[PDB]
């Protein structure tokens, strides 16, 4: 019967015990600006400062940065605490703080935000989350790998008994804006396209040129016009280019344009077209069971 | 300024180029389970977007909660 209790016992890895801080993951929907994001960080910041005065001893969030992808819809709050002696009581321990945090997150609208502790050796995952990649070997379309992917996120949602979050790090295919140029229009202008584009990414991606010295310090040079001048597609039409004659030329003299998708954060794993598939299991089920599950769903 | 005052000007937030070569905006349904409608989004105007197709004033368009919600989930309205 000793052997019975031996085999019936569940397992784990080395625990997330205390850190003194917790790592606060903040995710927004895509397309939203760093201004709206900044507003969100002010709100969450205001929550853990004002409504959590009693223990919170740090803040630091990064607007624009994500370790899960450096994009406009994410931010991180580094949130420390008091002394251990200054936080007695089980509610003054990090996990319950994160539980009340999750209740706040459920309360928080317009967001996908969660805080947590990292591993003590942070290079391992979430310690309940397997990392899972999935790569089309045949090159069958990243978008169709995304079809089969989020298809298998629906399938990954078909087993809530297995998992606790089937969530990816999917940075979505975006609305985005392709501008097409006619060369026979361009040769009708007789102007070098390379310098038109040099003008473009100079004014719409920004142009580095070279360096200089202040007080013995080599420094970069950047140039791109005003935000109000780099904001609209119609602002695109504002830009006039000298041609072989000397005439100032709108882009719209030769530029069509349209919209489409495209994800900013693409991924390739071992040099192979991949998408980040996180997952944590429901407590009481090993991740090898999740391997058997999703690998028998890798039949699909 | 300007021409005909009836002009469907929704801000940029619900504006989705969806799908490929296309552009829809998702409205809620009348029974709170949401209901996307493809619309001809015209030129962006200000912080907004001209639409010619279909929509009227008073149509229960959204802002915030579009990510926990897919078509088929009831919704309690907020502004």
């Amino acid at each position: 019967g000793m052997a019975y209790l031996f085999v019936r016992l569940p397992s784990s890895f080395l625990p997330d015990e205390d850190q003194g801080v917790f790592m606060t993951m903040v995710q927004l929907p895509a397309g939203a600006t760093q201004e709206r994001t900044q507003k969100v960080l002010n709100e969450v910041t205001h929550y853990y400062l004002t409504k959590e005065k009693n223990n919170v001893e740090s803040v630091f969030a990064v607007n624009g940065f994500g370790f899960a992808g450096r994009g406009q819809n994410t931010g991180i709050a580094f949130v420390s605490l008091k002394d251990w002696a200054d936080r007695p009581g089980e509610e003054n321990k990090v996990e319950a703080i994160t539980m009340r945090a999750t209740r706040a997150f459920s309360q928080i609208k317009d967001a996908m935000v969660f805080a947590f502790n990292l591993p003590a050796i942070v290079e391992l995952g979430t310690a309940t989350g397997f990392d899972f990649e999935l790569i089309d070997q045949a090159g069958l379309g990243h978008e169709k790998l995304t079809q089969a992917r989020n298809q298998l996120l629906a399938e990954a949602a078909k087993h809530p008994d297995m998992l606790t979050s089937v969530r990816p790090n999917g940075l979505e295919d975006t609305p985005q804006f392709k501008i097409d140029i006619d060369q026979e229009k361009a040769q009708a202008l007789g102007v070098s396209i390379n310098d038109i584009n040099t003008t473009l990414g100079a004014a719409w991606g920004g142009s580095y040129v070279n360096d200089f010295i202040d007080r013995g310090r080599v420094k970069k040079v950047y140039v791109m016009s005003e935000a109000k001048y780099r904001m609209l597609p119609d602002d695109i039409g504002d830009w006039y280019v000298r041609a072989a004659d000397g005439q100032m030329v709108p882009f719209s003299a030769f530029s069509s344009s349209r919209w489409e998708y495209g994800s900013p954060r693409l991924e390739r794993y071992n040099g192979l077209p991949s998408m980040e598939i996180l997952g944590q299991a429901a407590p009481g089920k090993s991740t090898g069971e999740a391997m058997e599950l999703m690998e028998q769903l890798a039949s699909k | 300024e300007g021409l005909n005052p009836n002009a469907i000007l929704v801000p940029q937030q619900g504006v989705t180029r969806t799908p490929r070569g296309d552009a829809t905006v998702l409205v809620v349904g009348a029974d709170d389970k949401v209901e996307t409608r493809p619309i001809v989004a015209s030129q962006a105007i200000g912080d907004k977007w001209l639409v010619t197709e279909g929509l009227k004033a008073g149509d229960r368009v959204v802002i915030s909660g579009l990510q926990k919600v897919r078509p088929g989930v009831q919704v309690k309205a907020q502004e």
């Binding site: 609208k109 317009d110 | 300024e1 300007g2 021409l3 005909n4 005052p5 009836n6 002009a7 469907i8 000007l9 929704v10 809620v28 929509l55 009227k56 004033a57 008073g58 149509d59 229960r60 368009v61 959204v62 802002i63 915030s64 909660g65 579009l66 926990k68 919600v69 989930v73 009831q74 919704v75 309690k76 309205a77 907020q78 502004e79």
Partner: peptide
């Protein structure tokens, strides 16, 4: 579940 739901009024141009 509640959602932020903002509704159309498009009177002038």
């Amino acid at each position: 579940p509640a959602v932020g739901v903002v509704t159309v009024k498009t009177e002038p141009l």
